[PDB]
Amino acid sequence: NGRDSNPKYLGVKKFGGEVVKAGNILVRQRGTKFKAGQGVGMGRDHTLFALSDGKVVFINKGKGARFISIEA
Amino acid sequence: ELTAKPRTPKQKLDESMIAAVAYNKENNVSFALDRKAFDRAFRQQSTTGLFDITVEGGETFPALVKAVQMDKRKRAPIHVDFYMVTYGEPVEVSVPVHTTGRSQGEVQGGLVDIVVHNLQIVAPGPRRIPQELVVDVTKMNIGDHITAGDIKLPEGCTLAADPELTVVSVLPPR
Amino acid sequence: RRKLRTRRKVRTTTAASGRLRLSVYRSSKHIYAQIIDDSRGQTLAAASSAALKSGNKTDTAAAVGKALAAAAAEKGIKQVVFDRGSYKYHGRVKALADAAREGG
Amino acid sequence: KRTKFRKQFRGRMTGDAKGGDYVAFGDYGLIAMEPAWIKSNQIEACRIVMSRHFRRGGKIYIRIFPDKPVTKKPAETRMGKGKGAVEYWVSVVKPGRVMFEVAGVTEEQAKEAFRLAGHKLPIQTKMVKREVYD
Amino acid sequence: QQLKTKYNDQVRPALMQQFGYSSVMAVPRIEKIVVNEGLGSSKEDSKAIDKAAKELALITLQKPIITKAKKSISNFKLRQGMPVGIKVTLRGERMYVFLEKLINIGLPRIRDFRGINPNAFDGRGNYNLGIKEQLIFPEITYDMVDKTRGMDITIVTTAKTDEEARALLQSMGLPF
RNA sequence: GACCAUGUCCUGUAGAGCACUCACAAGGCUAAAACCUUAUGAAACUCCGAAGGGGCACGCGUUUAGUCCGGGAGUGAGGCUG
RNA sequence: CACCCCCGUGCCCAUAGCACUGUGGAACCACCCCACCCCAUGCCGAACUGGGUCGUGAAACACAGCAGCGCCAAUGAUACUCGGACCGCAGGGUCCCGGAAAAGUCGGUCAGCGCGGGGGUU
Ligand SMILES: [Mg+2]
Ligand SMILES: [Mg+2]
Ligand SMILES: [Mg+2]
Ligand SMILES: [Mg+2]
Ligand SMILES: [Mg+2]
Ligand SMILES: [Mg+2]
Ligand SMILES: [Mg+2]
Ligand SMILES: [Mg+2]
Ligand SMILES: [Mg+2]
Ligand SMILES: [Mg+2]
Ligand SMILES: [Mg+2]
Ligand SMILES: [Mg+2]
Ligand SMILES: [Mg+2]
Ligand SMILES: [Mg+2]
Numbered sequence A: 001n002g003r004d005s006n007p008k009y010l011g012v013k014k015f016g017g018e019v020v021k022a023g024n025i026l027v028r029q030r031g032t033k034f035k036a037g038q039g040v041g042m043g044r045d046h047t048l049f050a051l052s053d054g055k056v057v058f059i060n061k062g063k064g065a066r067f068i069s070i071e072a
Numbered sequence B: 001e002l003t004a005k006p007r008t009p010k011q012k013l014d015e016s017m018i019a020a021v022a023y024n025k026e027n028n029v030s031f032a033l034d035r036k037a038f039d040r041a042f043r044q045q046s047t048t049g050l051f052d053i054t055v056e057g058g059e060t061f062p063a064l065v066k067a068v069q070m071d072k073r074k075r076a077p078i079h080v081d082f083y084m085v086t087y088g089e090p091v092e093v094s095v096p097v098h099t100t101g102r103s104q105g106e107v108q109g110g111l112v113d114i115v116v117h118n119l120q121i122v123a124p125g126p127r128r129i130p131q132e133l134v135v136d137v138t139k140m141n142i143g144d145h146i147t148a149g150d151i152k153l154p155e156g157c158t159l160a161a162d163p164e165l166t167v168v169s170v171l172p173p174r
Numbered sequence C: 001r002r003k004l005r006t007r008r009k010v011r012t013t014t015a016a017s018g019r020l021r022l023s024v025y026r027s028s029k030h031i032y033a034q035i036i037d038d039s040r041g042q043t044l045a046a047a048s049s050a051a052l053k054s055g056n057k058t059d060t061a062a063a064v065g066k067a068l069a070a071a072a073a074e075k076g077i078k079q080v081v082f083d084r085g086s087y088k089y090h091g092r093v094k095a096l097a098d099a100a101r102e103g104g
Numbered sequence D: 001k002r003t004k005f006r007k008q009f010r011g012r013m014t015g016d017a018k019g020g021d022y023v024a025f026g027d028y029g030l031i032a033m034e035p036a037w038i039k040s041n042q043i044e045a046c047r048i049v050m051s052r053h054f055r056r057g058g059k060i061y062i063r064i065f066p067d068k069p070v071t072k073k074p075a076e077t078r079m080g081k082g083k084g085a086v087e088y089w090v091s092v093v094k095p096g097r098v099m100f101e102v103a104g105v106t107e108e109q110a111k112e113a114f115r116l117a118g119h120k121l122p123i124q125t126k127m128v129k130r131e132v133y134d
Numbered sequence E: 001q002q003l004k005t006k007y008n009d010q011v012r013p014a015l016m017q018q019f020g021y022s023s024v025m026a027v028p029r030i031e032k033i034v035v036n037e038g039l040g041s042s043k044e045d046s047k048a049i050d051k052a053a054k055e056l057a058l059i060t061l062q063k064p065i066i067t068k069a070k071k072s073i074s075n076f077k078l079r080q081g082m083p084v085g086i087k088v089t090l091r092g093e094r095m096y097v098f099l100e101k102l103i104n105i106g107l108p109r110i111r112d113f114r115g116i117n118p119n120a121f122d123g124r125g126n127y128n129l130g131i132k133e134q135l136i137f138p139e140i141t142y143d144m145v146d147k148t149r150g151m152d153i154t155i156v157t158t159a160k161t162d163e164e165a166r167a168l169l170q171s172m173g174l175p176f
Numbered sequence F: 001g002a003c004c005a006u007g008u009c010c011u012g013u014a015g016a017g018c019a020c021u022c023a024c025a026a027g028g029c030u031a032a033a034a035c036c037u038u039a040u041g042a043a044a045c046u047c048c049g050a051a052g053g054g055g056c057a058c059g060c061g062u063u064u065a066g067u068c069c070g071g072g073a074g075u076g077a078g079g080c081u082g
Numbered sequence G: 001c002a003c004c005c006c007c008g009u010g011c012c013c014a015u016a017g018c019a020c021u022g023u024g025g026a027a028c029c030a031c032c033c034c035a036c037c038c039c040a041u042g043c044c045g046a047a048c049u050g051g052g053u054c055g056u057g058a059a060a061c062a063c064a065g066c067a068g069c070g071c072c073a074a075u076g077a078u079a080c081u082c083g084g085a086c087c088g089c090a091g092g093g094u095c096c097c098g099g100a101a102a103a104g105u106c107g108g109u110c111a112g113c114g115c116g117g118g119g120g121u122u
Helices: B036-045 B104-108 C003-010 C057-073 C094-102 D040-052 D107-119 E002-018 E046-060 E093-103 E163-170
Strands: A025-027 A040-042 A048-050 A055-060 A066-071 B020-023 B067-070 B077-083 B091-096 B111-114 B118-123 B145-147 B166-171 C035-037 D028-032 D036-039 D060-062 D068-070 D088-093 D098-102 D125-129 E030-036 E065-068 E083-090 E127-131 E151-157
Touching (some): D040 D098, D040 D107, E002 E163, E083 E093, E127 E163, E151 E163
Antiparallel strands (some): B145 B166, D028 D098, D028 D125, D068 D088, E030 E083, E127 E151
């Protein structure tokens, strides 16, 4: 063994209560650990970036049912 | 008897078997107990009976011990739970099992194991619950198991466990 | 099962586009076909077939569409999204769309 | 005691026991006083001796079990390369966790059984009789 | 055609009289008749398997479909995605004809103590049928079709009761 | 700036649990997998799950640092304790 | 939101779901009804689908009862831990302050809020 692979510094890049420019990246994820609410659009590797400038808010009933909206 | 100790008061090195709540729909109550004097009663009553307490204020309150929270590191009690008795078949209590006499497998066979040392049942009588359950094991042969289904249940008691569950069972030696 | 309707109604993510959606119920030919702004829990333009008659269901459906088109144009609406139900765009409902946008 | 198939290696730590602080099954029993690993072989010696005291008996549950491999490095080698391969299995035994639990044998007989069964053990222990059990 | 519908209409009052329903629709009906060839007992080349689909099609006036092997590599010559037995649903006029082919003159009657011994047990529809062999036709000539595969034929009927299964054969021209 | 307080969001550790995976303890049941009562461990198990911790905003409060831009560096062998 | 009830479509996002079950009927919905064609089945008008009344509330669906199940779930007590301060050679553990679960008991629920329309008391 003695093998390993680079860190992928994934996360909630922008936490609810953070104003965001358009195109800011807010969550990094392997998949849909977050499912993108209103105003946000999710990319190829399933990072989801805000489309509209404003505050970031978490809709989060959880269990795969967590969504990131942006409010203007 | 017990005194009030609401919130988190300190205890005496006389254990005062604290951390005791009695509850139903009505009211929650305070902790403080009288240490060994608790144990001296509990072993006699041992979940299958009730006894009144008299904190200052409420001169009487019947409860039947729901559960105990003993220390792990030094086998001693700590917290005890209680449930009030609303009477009129409301009681869901775990009766101890007991076994009578020589069995036919205790004659020439070997072991006589109680697979369920205690078993839960509802009691039609609230203030009258069996203190034990002597079982007539005399007539079983070696390799037979008395199932719960034929366990005597005095005075209209229901059985809160599977009819087909084994309770006692004679076992071969070795 | 009828995973046609939850699928087609999750595909109206473009209610985020601002257009209203136009539900249809090719059931008993009741084809009531409401128009809804989802943001409020509000519907804005009913067209139930209570006594419209008009004959066979495929043409009574187009009658329901042509009547609702007026019923919604009164209030000032023009953006449209045809949230089909489980049903296909097979004709008896397709007439509803043809007659509806014939006279928006 | 040996575990029939696994994943290969482990690690270690301790804090007080959360599984098996109360006795069931048996009549009397025995409890740890000290946190520790216990090898398969320490179990098997307790079984051998308490089966010596329990001829034609059959009242010997073993409510513990070597789950954890532990792997010494080979002969004389400087450090470098893996944890060799496993040398023996051990069971974590935190205090208050029962190990042993007899039935069917009179108090002084079980008491002597537990004397010998503890003396082969690497820990303090205590015999207990069951009554404060829900 | 008309005779199968007449036997349906004679069964439905027969069941309302042996067991009253509030509704004729509550009465048992026969939904579909399925026939499942299973040439995985004799997996072949395209020749023999298309020939068996050919014979079922000639018997049916339907195009049989091939059931295809599930992902299940196995000891028994099992593979990934290959044919493993024909299937044929029948509903409507194509179904009842076959039952009227079987209840009446078109029954081969090649072997019959009674009807096949009862198997639904639970009494809701599913009445499975086994034909051990197909030496049961004038559609074949035995020397050329010297091979003789069997057939499975499941009857599907509504029935919320166990005893009600008796209705779907006794009054339906089948021995019991 | 910095600490500290409020608000908010994100986390899968300690613990704890077997609901899935591996393991495993006494029996009942039975063509034994399965199943039930009882009983347990888990770095690559999680029905759960703190304390804390990080980002934002405020300062609703005490403080004095910070940021960038230009000249010069050295350092890139660490040691202990908890 | 005059009172109920039906068809639909939302918010919610198992305290709303399961099962047992009873009411429902041409008002609504639902099966049954026929198929050369619109249209379709990798075979079947089963599914889409197109042409309709009877018939029937059977099934499905709606709505009530329902605490067997699931779902939630205290208080209390612990586990643990931020800071402080200690003991044991060691594994390990204690104390002061404050935050504090998980499991279980007690107990809670077979929901709760809209919007448009259809038919009722005529
Ligand atoms: Mg650790
Ligand atoms: Mg436990
Ligand atoms: Mg290595
Ligand atoms: Mg600042
Ligand atoms: Mg742990
Ligand atoms: Mg960290
Ligand atoms: Mg400001
Ligand atoms: Mg410089
Ligand atoms: Mg270096
Ligand atoms: Mg270093
Ligand atoms: Mg508490
Ligand atoms: Mg503090
Ligand atoms: Mg600390
Ligand atoms: Mg504390």
